[PDB]
């Protein structure tokens, strides 16, 4: 018995009133469950038996449904209404939950601000070079970072990362990192990083030469 | 009425998992309780149940390695989980599974804060940190960015600050990113005034518990001057 949530992402400004619906494989009558999952804290329980709003918490949270179909709306969007929902069925075991969906705010698209950080000297002395390129308060989240070494495209020497929107200018930020030996690094001289997002009508690239 | 989880935080592999539930405000006895994992990328996971009845109601697809118990002398109940792969790495939550004697099954209604438990062989070790100096090449307008790599650590996690806690303004502590070497790495920046730059002294403070590392880098800029 599976549960299937929809949207699996959904963006909204603070104060719509947005709806997340659940759908089950089978009949299951009422029992269902909502959560909120805010990273850092622990879960909480908004509604159960579908409908029946959880004590404590803000009647601008409410549940229908029966059967197959459940729907979990929320009026008025606050601050802290943006974060992961699961509903999950009770009917037997196993219980499931659904796949959740991520709510996040929506605003104007911005292009990131890209720096770039060669190694550091003290880093250089072990013998492993870390480029670091950081792509700073940007939005929509989406963004891809190709480096470049001497022109030549990387591939599989990089790892990234990108912080949770932000609370305050709903912005995302990305921190990616080239990976390459001391040699190998003393060898080229230009580290370009190429960056993807729709806020750039095209690809820019910030690069430096190696010791200028 | 609380709940507090407690157990390794990284547990190698094919080796036996033991994680266990503090309670608080309430006798273990008179409640069913629950524990449910979250494998980072994936969603939830009903584990099992533990009941007074010591009935059996596990998930089958672990079924085969899991065990749930109850200490009343201890008021706890724990979750016992041989084998353990990279597959069982996640965040494991125990709750109060709520249910009403006509009525039936309710929800999952007191939940713990959770702990992440990483299956890894790699040994503790103590993060490297290497500054992101500002330069030419990381400044736009009146701001420049800076701040520290912390390389080669595990496992999580690390803290940053930076000035003791004194600048939090723009500052950005990305999450971590796991290297075939096995070991962490993650970065956290700021971007502050250009000016200020000669003047204000900038120091990250990097902060792993796990190998009681405890380093503060400062962060001087890097220019032709």
């Known amino acids: 018995l599976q549960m299937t949530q929809s949207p699996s992402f959904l963006s909204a400004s603070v104060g719509d009133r947005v709806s997340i619906t659940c759908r089950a494989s089978q009949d299951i009558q009422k029992f269902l469950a909502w959560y909120q999952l805010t990273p850092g804290d622990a879960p909480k329980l908004l509604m159960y038996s579908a409908s029946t709003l959880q004590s404590g918490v803000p009647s601008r949270f409410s549940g229908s449904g029966s059967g197959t179909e459940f729907t979990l709306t929320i009026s008025g969007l606050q601050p802290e209404d943006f974060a992961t929902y699961y509903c999950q069925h009770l009917k037997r075991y196993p219980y499931t939950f659904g796949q959740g969906t991520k709510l996040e705010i929506s605003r104007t698209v911005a292009a990131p601000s890209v720096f770039i950080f060669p190694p550091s000297d003290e880093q250089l002395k072990s013998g492993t070079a870390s480029v670091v390129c950081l792509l700073n308060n940007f939005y929509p989240r989406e963004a891809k970072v190709q480096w470049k070494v001497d022109n030549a495209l990387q591939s599989g020497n990089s790892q990234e990362s990108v912080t949770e929107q932000d609370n305050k200018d709903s912005t995302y930020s990305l921190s990616s990192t080239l990976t390459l030996s001391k040699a190998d690094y003393e060898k080229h001289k230009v580290y370009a990083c190429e960056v993807t997002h729709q806020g750039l009508s095209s690809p820019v690239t910030k690069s430096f030469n190696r010791g200028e | 009425v609380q709940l507090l989880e407690s157990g390794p935080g990284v547990v190698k592999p094919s080796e036996t998992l033991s994680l266990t539930c503090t309670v608080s405000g309430a006798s273990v006895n008179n409640y069913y309780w629950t524990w449910v994992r979250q494998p980072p990328g994936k969603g939830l996971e009903w584990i099992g149940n533990?009941?007074?009845?010591?009935?059996?109601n596990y998930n089958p697809s672990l079924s085969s390695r899991l065990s749930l118990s109850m200490d009343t002398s201890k008021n706890q109940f724990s979750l016992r989980l041989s084998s353990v792969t990279a597959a069982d790495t996640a965040t494991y939550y125990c709750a109060r599974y709520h249910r009403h004697f006509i009525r039936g099954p309710l929800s999952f209604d007191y939940w713990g804060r959770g702990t992440l438990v990483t299956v890894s062989s790699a040994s503790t070790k103590g993060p490297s940190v290497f500054p992101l100096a500002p330069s030419s090449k990381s400044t736009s307008g009146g701001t420049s960015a800076l701040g520290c790599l912390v390389k080669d650590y595990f496992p999580e996690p690390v803290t940053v600050s930076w000035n003791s806690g004194a600048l939090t303004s723009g500052v950005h502590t990305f999450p971590a990113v796991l290297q075939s070497s096995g070991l962490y790495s993650l970065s956290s920046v700021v971007t502050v005034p250009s000016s200020s730059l000669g003047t204000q002294t900038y120091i990250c403070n990097v902060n792993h518990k796990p190998s009681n590392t405890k380093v503060d880098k400062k962060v001087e800029p890097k220019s032709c001057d």
């Open positions: 533990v009941y007074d009845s010591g009935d059996t």
